[PDB]
Every structure is written in C-alpha cells, then in structure tokens.
Amino acid sequence: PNRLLCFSIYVTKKPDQSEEDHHNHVSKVNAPMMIPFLKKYGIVRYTVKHNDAYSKPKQAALMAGQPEENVLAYDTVFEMIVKDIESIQTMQKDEEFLRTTIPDHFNFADMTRSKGSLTWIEEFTF
Amino acid sequence: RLLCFSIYVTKKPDQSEEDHHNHVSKVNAPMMIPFLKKYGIVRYTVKHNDAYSKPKQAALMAGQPEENVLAYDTVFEMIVKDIESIQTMQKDEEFLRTTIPDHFNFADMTRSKGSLTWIEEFTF
C-alpha cells in the first residue's frame, strides 16, 4: 500500500468576524462549494476541524494544567487526504475553482495568518 | 459530533529527523495503540513531516513564504466521541508507567502544542 498524503490548511478567521459567522460560513457555504471539486480531482477524504464555542470548553477541560500558550489558536483546519499532490495542483488550476472559491475566502479567512502543511500519514481505524 | 485531539510534536533538540520518525513509527505509535483501543479512541493518525514528504511539501507550497509552512515534525490525531476517553487513559497508571518515559526519546515537550476540535468528515 502506497503512503497517503495529508494537505492541511490552518485558517484564522477575520478579526471582526464572530466565531459563529466564521464556522457557519465554512460549513454552510464553503464546504458545499468545495466538495464537487474535491471529488472531481480525486481527493480521497476531506475533514473540517472546528475550534469554536462548541469545542472550546471541552478543549479547556482536556488541556487543563497545560499552559494556554500550548493550545493551537486556529479557528478552522481543512485536511485533504490525497494519493499525490498532483490532485491538489490540478484542482487549484481549475478556472471555475479559482473564480468561485477564491472570492469566497474573503468571507471567512484572514489570509495573512494562514499556514499549511503536507505530511505523509499512518492511519489506524479501530 | 466527533472530536479530534491533535498533538503537535517538535522532535528532541539534537535528534535526527530519521531517528525521530523511526522511533515514532516503530516504537511509540505501536506502544500507544493498545491503550487507545482500550479507552475507545475511534481512529488514530500519525502525520510525518520528514524527508519523504518534504520535497512534495516544498513543491506544493511553492509561491508561499517559508514561514507559512507548519514546522512540526510529527502530528498525532486521536478521534474520540468524548474527552473523557483521553482523560481516563491519562489516568491509567499502567499507561503512565509504560509510555511517559518514552516521550523523552522523541519529543521536545517544551515546544509541543495541542488542539481539541469538533470535525465534519467527507469520504468520496
């Protein structure tokens, strides 16, 4: 079995946007926009991770006793599992992809505080 | 809503990338797995940022500043139904006697971070 890759995008919301509006946009607008492209270009699995009012009390309880500075601050993380980075590169060159998803970034992301990572993964489902 | 507890690991100050990832893959992850199973973790993922993936990462993130690249060596992700699963495991003294000393063989604990999120997942 060939190693799968994970492309993660760490997203910080706009400073004046509420967490509510950020996560509602991501779930109700951006994800429906993204999913047909992800499927078309062969992304295997797509996960959206939310650090919002629902999870933050659980995070605080779990990480109690650790410094607050050790908690990752990003509002949303997008993970794309792929067999090859060519999948992502091809989608990012799709002209309809560029003309619809790029303007939508301005509705939820501060693109001056985005980070990314491309890793290979070992997965265990129990 | 399923939850994801992610641990972002910075390797030991003077350890080789190769030695770090061999230790994670051959020793630490297999050692963790019986306890994760016992306490009801759904899925466990180890993400490696090493010599195999870095050429691909550099290619993919070309045109982005170097500082936009996450610098962690390894990320551990545990999918759970509740935080109590992890909290219960973290109080198992067999788990603590067995696994805590191992952290010193691959992790710089001063530079590590964690995150607990809720997730939406799509499979195509």
Side-chain angles (χ1 to χ4, degrees), chain A, chain B residues 1-11 13 15-65 67-124:
Chain A
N2 296 269
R3 284 173 177 182
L4 293 183
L5 300 172
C6 180
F7 183 37
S8 306
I9 307 186
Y10 300 82
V11 171
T12 311
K13 77 173 176 63
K14 323 222 289 293
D16 287 320
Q17 176 166 65
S18 66
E19 298 191 326
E20 181 179 32
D21 290 345
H22 175 82
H23 294 281
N24 280 339
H25 192 88
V26 163
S27 293
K28 293 183 180 180
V29 180
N30 187 261
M33 198 178 277
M34 290 286 313
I35 277 152
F37 293 116
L38 296 169
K39 176 198 163 203
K40 180 178 181 202
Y41 291 106
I43 282 61
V44 182
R45 166 168 101 240
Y46 186 56
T47 304
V48 177
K49 300 168 69 179
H50 298 272
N51 169 36
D52 71 356
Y54 176 87
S55 63
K56 275 177 196 274
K58 303 168 170 74
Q59 178 172 258
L62 180 56
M63 301 179 70
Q66 303 179 62
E68 193 152 44
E69 191 89 300
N70 292 353
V71 181
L72 211 72
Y74 295 100
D75 297 281
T76 295
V77 187
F78 305 91
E79 319 206 335
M80 299 185 184
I81 303 306
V82 299
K83 295 190 235 223
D84 192 291
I85 69 152
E86 172 143 314
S87 300
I88 298 155
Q89 285 176 308
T90 306
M91 174 176 72
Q92 187 80 30
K93 283 317 172 258
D94 180 311
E95 284 269 305
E96 192 59 28
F97 178 85
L98 289 180
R99 158 176 82 180
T100 60
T101 65
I102 295 314
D104 193 59
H105 294 172
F106 294 86
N107 298 314
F108 68 96
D110 175 1
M111 289 282 99
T112 81
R113 291 185 272 161
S114 305
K115 290 207 172 203
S117 90
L118 186 291
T119 58
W120 72 264
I121 75 191
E122 316 185 61
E123 334 180 68
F124 312 87
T125 306
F126 304 135
Chain B
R1 284 170 168 181
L2 280 181
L3 302 173
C4 180
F5 183 38
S6 297
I7 304 170
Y8 297 84
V9 173
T10 295
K11 75 176 157 54
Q15 179 178 47
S16 80
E17 262 182 35
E18 173 188 321
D19 285 337
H20 175 81
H21 293 281
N22 283 322
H23 188 85
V24 167
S25 290
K26 302 143 154 303
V27 183
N28 182 261
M31 173 186 65
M32 284 312 282
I33 279 162
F35 301 105
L36 301 171
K37 272 162 204 210
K38 179 178 183 204
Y39 292 104
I41 278 72
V42 175
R43 172 170 100 211
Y44 182 55
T45 305
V46 181
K47 290 159 48 163
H48 302 263
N49 173 29
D50 70 0
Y52 175 85
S53 59
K54 279 175 191 284
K56 304 178 175 47
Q57 175 174 258
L60 179 61
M61 289 167 73
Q64 291 182 234
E67 52 265 43
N68 278 3
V69 179
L70 225 66
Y72 300 101
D73 295 290
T74 49
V75 182
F76 298 98
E77 306 193 320
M78 314 178 174
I79 305 292
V80 300
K81 299 186 204 198
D82 53 63
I83 67 151
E84 177 155 60
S85 300
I86 297 149
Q87 289 177 312
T88 305
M89 171 172 75
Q90 183 69 20
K91 296 271 171 293
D92 172 348
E93 290 215 345
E94 295 304 340
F95 167 82
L96 295 170
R97 162 152 80 168
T98 303
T99 64
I100 282 306
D102 195 55
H103 293 165
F104 304 80
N105 304 318
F106 71 95
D108 170 10
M109 299 309 258
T110 76
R111 276 168 109 200
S112 293
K113 304 213 170 207
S115 160
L116 189 282
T117 50
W118 73 263
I119 69 169
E120 299 169 87
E121 197 142 56
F122 311 86
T123 309
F124 299 125

